[PDB]
């Protein structure tokens, strides 16, 4: 404890994600909508708006 | 106001027990990075120290103003060193006051 | 858990000591660095070791 600052300890967690390849497992709070088709609008397929 | 100059040259430099000396956070440099310092070398070192308050540290850098860039020490347009700060609290002030 | 000196050594693209030898990044690594003080939960003043 007498040691100065930059000798301190440090927990570190490294959240390390990967892209979207695989069909998606993961994610969260993002309310599902009635799919309407042959129409122009707006789409959120897992993530990638257009 | 009163900065003290060491040359240092002639001699094996060794960048990665610098941080076993002083306990700091980050190795900030300018003109080169911090994780390449051992590979390449230099024609001469210059160190500097000097004790500084906690406000005017983004002060000693390449092109700013206010006092201690202004009257005290100034960088230069192009350096291309390394600038160390740490904070001191324990070595360095006295209930009365450090005079 | 790491020293203080060596919590900029989590990134890409660097050297060191946890960097080479002991965790090392990918250059094209995404994600998120999350890292704390911990010296009231991992400290002793005999030494931790």
Redesign the interface.
């Known amino acids: 404890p007498t040691?100065?600052?930059?000798?301190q300890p440090y927990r570190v967690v490294v959240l390390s994600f990967e892209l979207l390849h695989a069909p998606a497992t993961v994610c969260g709070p993002k309310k599902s909508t009635n799919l309407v088709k042959n129409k122009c609008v707006n789409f959120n397929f897992n993530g990638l708006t257009g | 106001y009163a900065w003290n100059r060491k040359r240092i040259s002639n001699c094996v430099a060794d960048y990665?027990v610098i941080?076993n000396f002083?306990?700091?956070?980050?190795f900030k440099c300018y003109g080169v990075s911090p994780?390449?310092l051992n590979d390449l070398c230099f024609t001469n070192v210059y160190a500097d120290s000097f004790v500084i308050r906690g406000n005017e540290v983004s002060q000693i850098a390449p092109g700013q103003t206010g006092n201690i860039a202004d009257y005290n020490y100034k960088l230069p347009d192009d350096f291309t060193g390394c600038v160390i700060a740490?904070?001191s609290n324990?070595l360095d002030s006295k209930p009365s006051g450090n005079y």
């Open positions: 040691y100065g600052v930059g000798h | 990665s941080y002083a306990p700091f956070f980050a994780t390449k740490w904070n324990k």
